């Protein structure tokens, strides 16, 4: 059911909007459009964010919400970024998750319709610890959706690794 | 003055203690001793954490508090880790800060009294982007205190870089 309304602070002041509670800090900004900027997770939890404490919640498509509504992502158009759909297979079992829109260190991302489609989030280091340097997406926007975690950096579902030899990938096992 | 008591959740349940508010998630654990485990910062702020919402707050030395009381670190013996003093010159101007006790990727830390003393936190990549691989501390404990941020990984004040040639260091400019 709903997360408790009593310990939620949601606020927008001009061109910065924040949905927060005791575990989530979800920040969006206006430059020429509203975009999700950063989301910081003290812990990940499974309840629905209440409507009473949600900005811009009219005519919301659940599959557009970056942070899935099933893990208390607000049902808010602030919880969106052009070029990305819901991150249901992000690395939601990791600790110290921060989601932002920047390159994982030592990597690059190219937009091309050659890319494979959305799948589970992949960590930028292989099982043995090699860095995968090149990535693509069909039609995501840049800078790319990334998750920084206590175990490495991961890209959003849209962004797929570009490899030229056999490699073992570490991929998210979660579906949220 | 004090941060607002109204939007604070502080709880301990057996061997896991959490001090949280709308921006901070500060977690400690008991294994054989109580130690700070992780602290996640949606934003960094400057007010004092109220006593009313502080665990284990008797006979507290301010210079022992990992997260300085001046940036709303709780005045709590849960906010401590053997071998470390207050991180007043941690990288507190960065975004998406997570503090935990693990190695920055590709690095190692040795305890030796050869080390230089506590100073400002240093990022593990130089100005030009080279990785500093070797580090020391006089008498910190392992695993080392680290800050993961949207701009790289940084070590706690105690942990100093070990270099064999001229290099430009990126160091914290903050004193909190």
XYZ file of C-alpha atoms in Angstrom:
352
model
C 0.000 0.000 0.000
C 1.118 3.644 0.452
C 4.256 4.852 2.141
C 3.432 6.939 5.184
C 2.518 10.599 4.337
C 3.601 11.756 7.873
C 7.414 11.639 7.010
C 7.469 12.976 3.517
C 8.717 16.388 2.315
C 7.937 17.292 -1.194
C 8.745 20.779 -2.522
C 9.265 22.850 -5.567
C 10.727 26.277 -5.479
C 10.801 27.848 -8.934
C 12.962 25.517 -11.103
C 14.061 22.849 -8.566
C 11.662 20.194 -7.366
C 12.373 17.611 -4.650
C 10.369 14.560 -3.539
C 11.870 13.252 -0.349
C 11.227 10.952 2.539
C 13.366 9.247 5.172
C 15.075 7.080 2.500
C 14.636 8.770 -0.910
C 15.849 12.170 -2.214
C 14.432 12.642 -5.728
C 15.422 15.869 -7.457
C 14.261 17.326 -10.748
C 15.137 20.594 -12.461
C 13.909 22.941 -15.076
C 16.345 24.264 -17.674
C 14.195 24.462 -20.859
C 12.229 21.335 -19.830
C 11.674 19.508 -16.526
C 14.016 16.540 -16.199
C 14.973 14.201 -13.402
C 18.428 15.252 -12.245
C 19.427 12.978 -9.338
C 17.952 10.385 -7.035
C 19.703 9.171 -3.919
C 18.560 6.061 -2.017
C 19.479 5.474 1.585
C 17.682 2.146 1.226
C 15.286 0.837 -1.502
C 11.785 0.030 -0.415
C 8.563 -1.336 -1.793
C 5.443 0.748 -1.157
C 3.726 3.367 -3.322
C 4.475 7.062 -2.894
C 1.300 8.820 -1.878
C -0.578 11.144 -4.308
C -1.173 13.666 -1.532
C 2.655 14.215 -1.560
C 3.180 14.067 -5.368
C 3.800 17.080 -7.724
C 2.604 17.062 -11.350
C 0.636 13.812 -11.003
C -2.110 14.312 -13.616
C -2.195 12.016 -16.667
C 0.856 9.983 -15.701
C 1.962 6.936 -17.633
C 3.541 4.385 -15.255
C 5.976 3.085 -17.905
C 7.503 6.603 -18.198
C 8.442 6.794 -14.510
C 12.248 6.428 -14.158
C 12.066 5.116 -10.600
C 9.281 2.490 -10.799
C 6.131 3.284 -8.804
C 6.414 -0.271 -7.281
C 9.586 0.782 -5.408
C 8.007 4.039 -4.181
C 8.873 6.101 -7.226
C 6.566 9.101 -7.265
C 3.755 9.011 -9.833
C 4.944 12.306 -11.039
C 6.003 13.782 -14.335
C 9.089 15.076 -12.444
C 10.144 11.396 -12.211
C 10.954 11.335 -16.014
C 13.677 12.016 -18.483
C 13.257 12.202 -22.233
C 14.603 9.102 -23.908
C 14.106 6.737 -20.961
C 11.351 4.517 -19.738
C 10.917 2.947 -16.346
C 14.026 1.340 -14.865
C 12.343 -1.822 -13.624
C 15.570 -3.868 -14.129
C 17.984 -1.374 -12.708
C 20.420 -2.548 -10.077
C 17.946 -2.129 -7.185
C 19.624 -4.681 -4.905
C 22.827 -2.693 -4.591
C 23.779 -0.508 -1.614
C 24.348 3.228 -1.724
C 22.538 3.827 -4.976
C 22.765 7.211 -6.654
C 21.060 7.685 -10.016
C 22.111 10.626 -12.181
C 22.731 11.543 -15.820
C 26.431 11.429 -16.526
C 28.986 8.956 -18.054
C 30.322 6.068 -15.987
C 34.065 6.731 -15.607
C 36.185 5.692 -18.650
C 33.124 5.004 -20.838
C 31.251 6.498 -23.744
C 27.732 6.072 -25.172
C 26.609 6.463 -28.842
C 23.009 6.822 -30.026
C 22.431 4.489 -33.016
C 19.555 2.286 -34.164
C 22.161 -0.569 -34.532
C 21.926 -1.035 -30.785
C 20.100 -3.913 -29.200
C 16.899 -3.103 -27.256
C 16.260 -2.421 -23.525
C 17.376 -5.192 -21.149
C 18.757 -5.630 -17.611
C 21.258 -3.030 -16.329
C 24.844 -3.998 -16.888
C 27.771 -3.016 -14.699
C 30.625 -1.319 -16.466
C 33.099 -3.868 -15.113
C 33.000 -7.491 -16.096
C 33.022 -10.387 -13.661
C 36.871 -10.490 -13.774
C 36.989 -6.679 -13.454
C 37.713 -5.401 -16.986
C 36.171 -2.065 -17.993
C 33.674 -2.140 -20.870
C 34.459 1.209 -22.590
C 31.852 1.503 -25.379
C 28.104 1.472 -25.138
C 25.082 2.297 -27.222
C 21.430 3.011 -27.088
C 18.727 3.043 -29.806
C 17.235 6.425 -28.905
C 18.065 7.417 -25.307
C 19.211 11.033 -24.651
C 22.622 12.105 -23.459
C 24.057 12.446 -20.921
C 23.274 8.763 -20.157
C 21.239 7.367 -17.182
C 23.690 5.828 -14.700
C 23.557 4.169 -11.316
C 26.574 4.572 -8.986
C 26.588 1.854 -6.264
C 28.937 0.491 -3.663
C 29.852 -2.244 -6.259
C 30.582 -0.087 -9.363
C 28.799 1.936 -11.975
C 25.821 0.591 -14.005
C 23.903 2.029 -16.957
C 20.193 2.325 -17.475
C 18.306 -0.431 -19.314
C 18.406 1.355 -22.660
C 22.218 1.538 -22.706
C 23.889 -1.662 -23.888
C 27.569 -2.675 -23.816
C 29.527 -2.887 -27.148
C 31.948 -5.796 -27.085
C 34.241 -7.355 -29.681
C 35.135 -10.565 -27.819
C 33.702 -13.111 -25.341
C 33.118 -11.542 -21.939
C 31.071 -12.373 -18.868
C 28.694 -9.513 -17.990
C 27.427 -8.656 -14.504
C 23.779 -7.773 -14.975
C 20.928 -6.834 -12.678
C 18.864 -9.792 -11.436
C 16.030 -7.549 -10.242
C 12.641 -6.832 -11.787
C 10.940 -4.137 -9.609
C 20.510 26.051 15.415
C 18.792 22.618 15.404
C 17.422 20.786 12.416
C 13.684 20.309 12.723
C 12.695 17.320 14.967
C 9.303 16.979 13.128
C 10.885 15.192 10.029
C 13.412 12.944 11.626
C 13.278 9.139 12.009
C 15.835 7.608 14.214
C 15.691 3.887 15.053
C 17.606 0.957 16.311
C 16.370 -2.550 16.057
C 18.768 -4.993 17.696
C 22.109 -4.604 15.825
C 21.223 -2.011 13.132
C 20.805 1.638 14.001
C 19.647 4.379 11.613
C 19.555 8.170 12.041
C 17.598 9.638 9.186
C 15.893 12.766 8.021
C 14.725 14.129 4.676
C 18.348 14.415 3.433
C 20.552 12.102 5.546
C 20.507 8.290 5.994
C 23.122 7.395 8.627
C 23.480 3.693 9.367
C 25.532 1.921 12.003
C 25.835 -1.763 12.850
C 26.900 -4.052 15.585
C 29.125 -7.019 14.761
C 31.417 -7.268 17.840
C 31.438 -3.454 18.241
C 29.184 -0.636 16.999
C 30.628 0.996 13.892
C 29.344 3.450 11.334
C 28.575 1.451 8.205
C 27.176 3.867 5.592
C 25.945 7.415 5.276
C 24.063 8.675 2.257
C 23.472 12.396 1.628
C 20.727 13.628 -0.633
C 22.092 17.107 0.043
C 24.571 18.387 2.710
C 23.246 20.898 5.167
C 24.391 22.997 8.070
C 22.315 22.746 11.250
C 22.768 20.572 14.343
C 20.974 17.247 14.682
C 18.690 17.414 17.675
C 19.470 15.478 20.912
C 15.829 14.450 21.245
C 16.394 12.351 18.047
C 19.925 11.068 18.876
C 20.852 7.509 20.097
C 23.819 6.903 22.423
C 24.493 10.609 23.026
C 26.033 10.535 26.525
C 29.683 11.573 26.958
C 30.309 12.309 23.291
C 33.530 13.829 22.046
C 32.833 16.068 19.021
C 36.216 15.316 17.399
C 35.291 11.586 17.250
C 32.144 12.173 15.183
C 32.758 10.980 11.585
C 30.137 13.281 10.086
C 30.863 16.633 11.796
C 28.129 17.916 14.123
C 28.349 21.293 12.230
C 26.890 19.635 9.099
C 24.106 17.918 11.075
C 26.095 14.849 12.024
C 24.390 13.264 15.008
C 26.127 13.733 18.366
C 26.035 10.052 18.767
C 28.533 7.320 19.451
C 26.938 5.500 16.464
C 28.507 8.255 14.305
C 32.053 6.778 14.909
C 34.494 4.275 13.586
C 37.641 3.127 15.334
C 40.706 4.671 13.769
C 39.008 7.811 12.435
C 38.313 11.248 13.745
C 35.897 13.823 12.445
C 35.899 14.333 8.680
C 35.805 18.122 8.744
C 37.771 18.335 5.436
C 35.946 15.633 3.582
C 34.614 16.418 0.140
C 31.383 18.012 1.438
C 30.792 20.181 -1.641
C 30.320 17.229 -3.960
C 26.957 15.894 -5.166
C 25.585 12.442 -4.466
C 27.835 11.688 -1.538
C 27.928 8.191 -0.094
C 30.350 7.463 2.741
C 31.226 3.842 3.491
C 34.175 1.667 4.509
C 35.594 -0.026 1.456
C 38.508 0.518 -1.032
C 38.178 3.051 -3.839
C 38.318 1.018 -7.070
C 41.874 0.055 -8.194
C 43.478 1.257 -4.937
C 45.032 -0.125 -1.795
C 45.761 1.285 1.680
C 48.608 0.286 4.085
C 48.773 1.139 7.791
C 52.286 2.437 8.626
C 53.651 5.172 10.883
C 55.715 6.380 7.823
C 52.557 8.043 6.567
C 52.009 11.759 6.725
C 49.303 13.034 9.119
C 45.591 13.886 8.584
C 44.894 16.509 5.898
C 42.236 17.397 3.299
C 40.507 14.525 1.450
C 42.136 13.654 -1.820
C 40.379 12.258 -4.869
C 41.795 9.055 -6.238
C 42.182 10.595 -9.692
C 44.567 13.411 -10.386
C 43.650 16.623 -12.165
C 44.572 15.043 -15.555
C 42.697 11.851 -14.585
C 45.419 9.357 -13.583
C 44.581 6.862 -10.829
C 46.648 7.088 -7.636
C 46.905 3.372 -6.681
C 48.715 3.359 -3.306
C 47.758 5.049 -0.092
C 48.636 4.980 3.565
C 47.477 5.965 6.965
C 49.316 6.237 10.316
C 46.785 4.275 12.370
C 43.356 4.200 10.680
C 41.475 0.843 10.564
C 40.657 -1.144 7.468
C 38.562 -1.252 5.414
C 39.292 2.450 4.690
C 36.846 5.426 5.004
C 35.803 6.469 1.489
C 33.493 8.989 -0.101
C 31.876 8.093 -3.458
C 30.628 11.246 -5.274
C 29.385 12.219 -8.688
C 33.022 13.348 -9.434
C 34.994 10.237 -8.314
C 36.081 8.460 -5.192
C 37.842 10.235 -2.268
C 39.450 8.906 0.912
C 39.032 10.066 4.461
C 41.443 12.637 5.915
C 43.659 10.035 7.560
C 44.393 8.248 4.269
C 47.131 9.892 2.213
C 48.241 9.215 -1.377
C 51.668 7.527 -1.999
C 53.336 8.993 -5.064
C 56.752 8.538 -6.661
C 56.650 11.468 -9.105
C 55.253 15.013 -9.505
C 51.467 14.986 -9.697
C 48.695 17.517 -9.229
C 46.226 16.367 -6.549
C 42.529 17.261 -6.390
C 41.833 17.911 -2.729
C 38.830 19.037 -0.728
C 38.572 22.815 -0.264
C 35.994 22.481 2.515
C 36.368 22.828 6.275
C 32.959 21.936 7.849
